[PDB]
A paper describes a structure:
The P. falciparum Bromodomain Protein 1 (PfBDP1) has been shown to interact with acetylated lysine modifications on histone H3 to regulate the expression of invasion-related genes. Recent studies on PfBDP1 have shown that it is a multidomain protein with a predicted ankyrin repeat in the N-terminal region, and a bromodomain (BRD) near the C-terminus. Bromodomains are conserved reader domains that are known to recognize acetyllysine marks on the N-terminal tails of histone proteins. A crystal structure of the PfBDP1 bromodomain (PfBDP1-BRD) reveals it contains the conserved bromodomain fold, but our comparative analysis between the PfBDP1-BRD and human bromodomain families indicates it has a unique binding mechanism.
To structurally characterize the PfBDP1-BRD in complex with the histone H3K14ac ligand, an expression construct containing residues 333–456 was used for the crystallization trials. Protein crystals of PfBDP1-BRD (333–456) grown in complex with the H3K14ac ligand diffracted to 2.0 Å. The structure was solved by molecular replacement with a monomer of the PfBDP1 bromodomain in the asymmetric unit. Disappointingly, no electron density was observed for the histone H3K14ac ligand. However, the final structure of PfBDP1-BRD (333–456) protein possesses the conserved bromodomain fold consisting of four left-handed alpha helices. The end of the αZ helix encodes a ‘HIF’ shelf that forms the bottom of the binding pocket, and the long and variable ZA loop (358–378 aa) frames one side of the binding pocket before connecting to the αA helix. The αB helix is 19 aa shorter than the αC helix and is connected by a 3-residue long BC loop, which contains the conserved asparagine residue N413 that is involved in the coordination of the acetyllysine moiety. Like other bromodomains, the predicted acetyllysine binding pocket of PfBDP1-BRD (333–456) has a conserved asparagine residue (Asn413) responsible for making a hydrogen bond to the acetyllysine, while the gatekeeper residue valine (Val419) and the HIF shelf motif (res 354–356) are important for ligand binding specificity. However, instead of the WPF shelf residues found in the family II BET-BRDs, the PfBDP1-BRD has a HIF shelf that is only observed in the human family IV BRPF3-BRD. Thus, the PfBDP1-BRD appears to be a cross between two human bromodomain families by having the ‘wide’ acetyllysine binding pocket observed in the BET bromodomains, combined with the shelf motif from BRPF3, which has a ‘keyhole’ type pocket due to its large Phe gatekeeper residue.
Author numbering: 333 to 456
The structure:
């Protein structure tokens, strides 16, 4: 469990410091950012800081869950923001960075190990 938790903490940190990442660090303050419709659109809000809290609190039980929450950030981004907007472009770029970091760091190996383990349990 701890090997993938470490990787996730590094990776959330890599996202926070990546170009444009500050946009996804905190939850949108709908009034303060002039986004008054944001939570009428985004019903599952997520930010890097929420994910850091989940890691801090040991709330992830499987490595895929961390990836699912990060991907939710990017999915909310593309849903709320038009595809030709600066924010949507930034979110696509960070999404590519993240998915490639999953490869370079070998995080996807933990997810595939997750699956085969879950699958053998079923076959017992």
């Amino acid at each position: 469990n701890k090997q993938w938790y470490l990787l996730a903490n590094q990776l959330i940190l890599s996202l926070s410091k990546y170009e444009g990442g500050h946009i996804f660090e905190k939850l949108v303050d709908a009034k303060k950012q002039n986004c008054p419709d944001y939570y009428d659109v985004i019903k599952n809000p997520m930010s890097f800081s929420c994910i850091k809290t989940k890691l801090k609190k040991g709330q992830y039980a499987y490595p895929s869950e961390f990836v699912k929450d990060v991907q939710l950030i990017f999915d909310n981004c593309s849903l709320y923001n038009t595809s030709n907007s600066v924010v949507a472009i930034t979110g696509k770029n960070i999404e590519t960075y993240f998915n490639n970091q999953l490869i370079v760091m070998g995080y996807n190996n933990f997810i595939l190990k997750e699956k085969k383990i879950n699958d053998m349990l079923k076959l017992v």
